[PDB]
mmCIF file of C-alpha atoms and ligand atoms in Angstrom:
data_model
loop_
_atom_site.group_PDB
_atom_site.id
_atom_site.type_symbol
_atom_site.label_atom_id
_atom_site.label_comp_id
_atom_site.label_asym_id
_atom_site.label_seq_id
_atom_site.Cartn_x
_atom_site.Cartn_y
_atom_site.Cartn_z
ATOM 1 C CA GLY Q 6 5.823 -10.769 -31.600
ATOM 2 C CA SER Q 7 4.317 -11.647 -28.229
ATOM 3 C CA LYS Q 8 0.638 -12.289 -27.743
ATOM 4 C CA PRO Q 9 -1.043 -10.095 -25.099
ATOM 5 C CA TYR Q 10 -0.862 -11.152 -21.467
ATOM 6 C CA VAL Q 11 -1.327 -9.770 -17.965
ATOM 7 C CA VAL Q 12 1.027 -10.430 -15.062
ATOM 8 C CA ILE Q 13 -0.937 -10.431 -11.799
ATOM 9 C CA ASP Q 14 0.071 -10.199 -8.151
ATOM 10 C CA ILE Q 15 -1.725 -9.690 -4.855
ATOM 11 C CA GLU Q 16 -0.863 -9.079 -1.244
ATOM 12 C CA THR Q 17 -3.087 -10.596 1.443
ATOM 13 C CA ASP Q 18 -3.333 -10.554 5.227
ATOM 14 C CA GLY Q 19 -2.815 -14.323 5.442
ATOM 15 C CA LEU Q 20 -2.705 -17.565 3.526
ATOM 16 C CA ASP Q 21 -6.331 -18.789 3.784
ATOM 17 C CA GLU Q 22 -8.296 -17.925 0.621
ATOM 18 C CA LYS Q 23 -11.616 -18.173 2.495
ATOM 19 C CA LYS Q 24 -10.842 -16.494 5.871
ATOM 20 C CA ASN Q 25 -8.114 -14.004 4.893
ATOM 21 C CA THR Q 26 -8.503 -11.205 2.366
ATOM 22 C CA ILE Q 27 -6.784 -9.137 -0.316
ATOM 23 C CA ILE Q 28 -5.059 -5.924 0.772
ATOM 24 C CA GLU Q 29 -3.488 -4.969 -2.576
ATOM 25 C CA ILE Q 30 -3.863 -6.051 -6.205
ATOM 26 C CA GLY Q 31 -1.480 -5.175 -9.028
ATOM 27 C CA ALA Q 32 -1.126 -6.102 -12.663
ATOM 28 C CA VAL Q 33 1.124 -5.409 -15.642
ATOM 29 C CA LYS Q 34 -0.654 -5.880 -18.972
ATOM 30 C CA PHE Q 35 1.152 -6.208 -22.281
ATOM 31 C CA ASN Q 36 -1.787 -5.364 -24.542
ATOM 32 C CA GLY Q 37 -0.083 -6.549 -27.738
ATOM 33 C CA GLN Q 38 1.402 -3.118 -28.462
ATOM 34 C CA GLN Q 39 2.548 -1.641 -25.143
ATOM 35 C CA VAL Q 40 2.392 -1.964 -21.350
ATOM 36 C CA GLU Q 41 -0.400 -0.783 -19.059
ATOM 37 C CA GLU Q 42 -0.636 -1.030 -15.276
ATOM 38 C CA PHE Q 43 -3.313 -1.577 -12.616
ATOM 39 C CA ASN Q 44 -2.936 -1.128 -8.864
ATOM 40 C CA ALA Q 45 -5.202 -0.660 -5.880
ATOM 41 C CA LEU Q 46 -4.889 -0.923 -2.142
ATOM 42 C CA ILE Q 47 -8.004 -2.345 -0.519
ATOM 43 C CA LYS Q 48 -10.009 -0.828 2.312
ATOM 44 C CA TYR Q 49 -9.716 -3.054 5.368
ATOM 45 C CA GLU Q 50 -11.818 -3.244 8.518
ATOM 46 C CA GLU Q 51 -10.002 -6.046 10.364
ATOM 47 C CA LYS Q 52 -6.891 -6.100 12.572
ATOM 48 C CA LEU Q 53 -3.914 -6.197 10.235
ATOM 49 C CA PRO Q 54 -1.278 -8.604 11.628
ATOM 50 C CA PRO Q 55 1.866 -6.561 12.386
ATOM 51 C CA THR Q 56 3.696 -9.374 10.572
ATOM 52 C CA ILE Q 57 2.096 -7.977 7.402
ATOM 53 C CA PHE Q 58 3.688 -4.623 8.184
ATOM 54 C CA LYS Q 59 7.197 -6.055 8.439
ATOM 55 C CA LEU Q 60 6.938 -7.937 5.142
ATOM 56 C CA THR Q 61 5.087 -5.377 2.995
ATOM 57 C CA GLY Q 62 5.291 -2.043 4.775
ATOM 58 C CA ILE Q 63 1.484 -1.788 4.533
ATOM 59 C CA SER Q 64 -0.244 -0.466 7.652
ATOM 60 C CA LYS Q 65 -3.872 0.123 8.598
ATOM 61 C CA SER Q 66 -3.224 3.833 8.097
ATOM 62 C CA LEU Q 67 -2.252 3.290 4.474
ATOM 63 C CA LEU Q 68 -5.317 1.161 3.771
ATOM 64 C CA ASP Q 69 -7.550 3.706 5.513
ATOM 65 C CA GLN Q 70 -6.056 6.591 3.519
ATOM 66 C CA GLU Q 71 -5.609 5.016 0.067
ATOM 67 C CA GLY Q 72 -7.671 1.826 0.098
ATOM 68 C CA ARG Q 73 -10.665 1.351 -2.175
ATOM 69 C CA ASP Q 74 -13.658 -0.945 -1.858
ATOM 70 C CA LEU Q 75 -12.751 -4.517 -2.781
ATOM 71 C CA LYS Q 76 -15.842 -5.198 -4.908
ATOM 72 C CA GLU Q 77 -15.337 -1.988 -6.895
ATOM 73 C CA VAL Q 78 -11.657 -2.793 -7.403
ATOM 74 C CA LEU Q 79 -12.400 -6.346 -8.519
ATOM 75 C CA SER Q 80 -14.927 -5.108 -11.080
ATOM 76 C CA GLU Q 81 -12.312 -2.740 -12.505
ATOM 77 C CA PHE Q 82 -9.730 -5.546 -12.447
ATOM 78 C CA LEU Q 83 -12.025 -7.727 -14.552
ATOM 79 C CA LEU Q 84 -12.324 -4.925 -17.116
ATOM 80 C CA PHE Q 85 -8.537 -4.483 -17.157
ATOM 81 C CA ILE Q 86 -7.753 -8.142 -17.802
ATOM 82 C CA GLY Q 87 -10.670 -9.060 -20.084
ATOM 83 C CA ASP Q 88 -10.126 -12.569 -21.451
ATOM 84 C CA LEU Q 89 -6.352 -12.196 -21.772
ATOM 85 C CA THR Q 90 -3.886 -14.861 -20.700
ATOM 86 C CA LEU Q 91 -2.871 -14.345 -17.072
ATOM 87 C CA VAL Q 92 0.724 -14.830 -15.914
ATOM 88 C CA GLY Q 93 2.161 -15.005 -12.437
ATOM 89 C CA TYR Q 94 4.651 -16.609 -10.075
ATOM 90 C CA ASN Q 95 2.982 -19.458 -8.184
ATOM 91 C CA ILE Q 96 -0.134 -18.015 -9.768
ATOM 92 C CA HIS Q 97 -2.586 -20.386 -8.100
ATOM 93 C CA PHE Q 98 -2.148 -18.347 -4.917
ATOM 94 C CA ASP Q 99 -3.406 -15.200 -6.627
ATOM 95 C CA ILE Q 100 -6.174 -16.990 -8.537
ATOM 96 C CA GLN Q 101 -7.496 -18.783 -5.455
ATOM 97 C CA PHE Q 102 -7.861 -15.503 -3.566
ATOM 98 C CA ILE Q 103 -9.219 -13.517 -6.514
ATOM 99 C CA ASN Q 104 -11.819 -16.145 -7.411
ATOM 100 C CA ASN Q 105 -12.863 -16.519 -3.775
ATOM 101 C CA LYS Q 106 -13.557 -12.797 -3.508
ATOM 102 C CA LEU Q 107 -15.167 -12.520 -6.946
ATOM 103 C CA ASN Q 108 -17.526 -15.289 -5.881
ATOM 104 C CA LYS Q 109 -18.236 -13.663 -2.501
ATOM 105 C CA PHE Q 110 -19.371 -10.465 -4.219
ATOM 106 C CA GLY Q 111 -21.411 -12.164 -6.950
ATOM 107 C CA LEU Q 112 -18.968 -11.196 -9.712
ATOM 108 C CA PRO Q 113 -17.907 -13.387 -12.653
ATOM 109 C CA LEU Q 114 -15.063 -15.788 -11.884
ATOM 110 C CA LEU Q 115 -11.858 -16.027 -13.889
ATOM 111 C CA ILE Q 116 -11.851 -18.341 -16.902
ATOM 112 C CA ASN Q 117 -8.627 -16.982 -18.401
ATOM 113 C CA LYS Q 118 -5.807 -19.181 -19.624
ATOM 114 C CA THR Q 119 -2.789 -19.008 -17.337
ATOM 115 C CA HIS Q 120 0.970 -19.492 -17.369
ATOM 116 C CA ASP Q 121 3.132 -19.747 -14.253
ATOM 117 C CA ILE Q 122 6.645 -18.323 -14.584
ATOM 118 C CA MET Q 123 7.718 -20.369 -11.559
ATOM 119 C CA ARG Q 124 7.053 -23.574 -13.496
ATOM 120 C CA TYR Q 125 9.335 -22.406 -16.309
ATOM 121 C CA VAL Q 126 12.043 -21.347 -13.843
ATOM 122 C CA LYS Q 127 12.027 -24.721 -12.089
ATOM 123 C CA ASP Q 128 12.646 -26.403 -15.451
ATOM 124 C CA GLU Q 129 15.375 -23.971 -16.586
ATOM 125 C CA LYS Q 130 17.214 -23.309 -13.279
ATOM 126 C CA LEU Q 131 17.609 -26.734 -11.706
ATOM 127 C CA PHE Q 132 20.320 -25.860 -9.167
ATOM 128 C CA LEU Q 133 18.644 -22.986 -7.316
ATOM 129 C CA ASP Q 134 18.755 -23.134 -3.529
ATOM 130 C CA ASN Q 135 14.993 -22.546 -3.462
ATOM 131 C CA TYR Q 136 12.271 -21.202 -5.752
ATOM 132 C CA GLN Q 137 11.069 -18.118 -3.934
ATOM 133 C CA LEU Q 138 10.636 -15.253 -6.389
ATOM 134 C CA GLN Q 139 13.696 -13.475 -4.996
ATOM 135 C CA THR Q 140 15.887 -16.516 -5.687
ATOM 136 C CA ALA Q 141 14.528 -16.849 -9.222
ATOM 137 C CA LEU Q 142 15.163 -13.178 -10.003
ATOM 138 C CA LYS Q 143 18.845 -13.361 -9.083
ATOM 139 C CA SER Q 144 19.330 -16.500 -11.211
ATOM 140 C CA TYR Q 145 18.284 -14.396 -14.236
ATOM 141 C CA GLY Q 146 20.417 -11.360 -13.399
ATOM 142 C CA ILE Q 147 17.663 -9.346 -11.698
ATOM 143 C CA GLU Q 148 19.137 -8.034 -8.440
ATOM 144 C CA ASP Q 149 16.092 -6.124 -7.172
ATOM 145 C CA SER Q 150 14.968 -6.864 -3.643
ATOM 146 C CA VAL Q 151 11.382 -8.155 -3.638
ATOM 147 C CA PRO Q 152 9.323 -5.419 -1.907
ATOM 148 C CA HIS Q 153 6.184 -7.522 -1.335
ATOM 149 C CA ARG Q 154 3.931 -4.868 -2.850
ATOM 150 C CA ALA Q 155 1.519 -5.997 -5.519
ATOM 151 C CA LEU Q 156 2.352 -3.771 -8.491
ATOM 152 C CA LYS Q 157 6.056 -3.640 -7.626
ATOM 153 C CA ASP Q 158 6.180 -7.440 -7.485
ATOM 154 C CA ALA Q 159 4.154 -7.704 -10.708
ATOM 155 C CA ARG Q 160 6.733 -5.512 -12.451
ATOM 156 C CA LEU Q 161 9.504 -7.839 -11.280
ATOM 157 C CA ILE Q 162 7.598 -10.903 -12.488
ATOM 158 C CA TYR Q 163 7.013 -9.167 -15.820
ATOM 159 C CA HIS Q 164 10.723 -8.418 -16.209
ATOM 160 C CA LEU Q 165 11.454 -12.052 -15.355
ATOM 161 C CA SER Q 166 8.955 -13.211 -17.988
ATOM 162 C CA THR Q 167 10.881 -11.371 -20.723
ATOM 163 C CA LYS Q 168 13.997 -13.415 -19.798
ATOM 164 C CA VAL Q 169 12.498 -16.947 -19.700
ATOM 165 C CA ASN Q 170 12.958 -18.298 -23.209
ATOM 166 C CA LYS Q 171 10.558 -21.240 -22.923
ATOM 167 C CA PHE Q 172 7.784 -18.874 -21.842
ATOM 168 C CA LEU Q 173 8.646 -16.477 -24.668
ATOM 169 C CA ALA Q 174 8.425 -19.277 -27.245
ATOM 170 C CA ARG Q 175 5.005 -20.349 -25.971
ATOM 171 C CA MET Q 176 3.658 -16.786 -26.186
ATOM 172 C CA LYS Q 177 4.806 -16.144 -29.784
HETATM 173 MG MG1 LIG D 201 2.702 -12.270 -3.820
HETATM 174 MG MG1 LIG D 202 3.482 -9.648 -4.005
#
């Protein structure tokens, strides 16, 4: 069957890998036998743009109450993923942020192989109006609204990955 792989997803407070930061990190690992999950909200000392609240529902209060230290979370994330293939949707966004913060804290950077589900979708679904994750999901019969929360989005990307035949063939 499938080789092991880990679907990753983050939420951030902006688009700049070097000035903005990670507010949530989620992952769905198929370990070769079954599925495991990773999720952490990140403690945050800056002024969270209310735009972040409207998209994700994450507020300062949530990060204050449930957030964990970013360096600690990233160390645990490295242990969760090991050297497994990483999978995502426009995955360079997640990797750019994760590597920037790993580097900032003096932690090892990612050297994992990667596959981007978005690339497979663009080649299989040529007539989509756009290639946002939400649009891709519907094209494959997944009607869930995208919540813009890291683990919840990772679950949706994982479900998508089990429906993209070209990806499945590559991972056999
Ligand atoms: Mg995302
Ligand atoms: Mg997300």
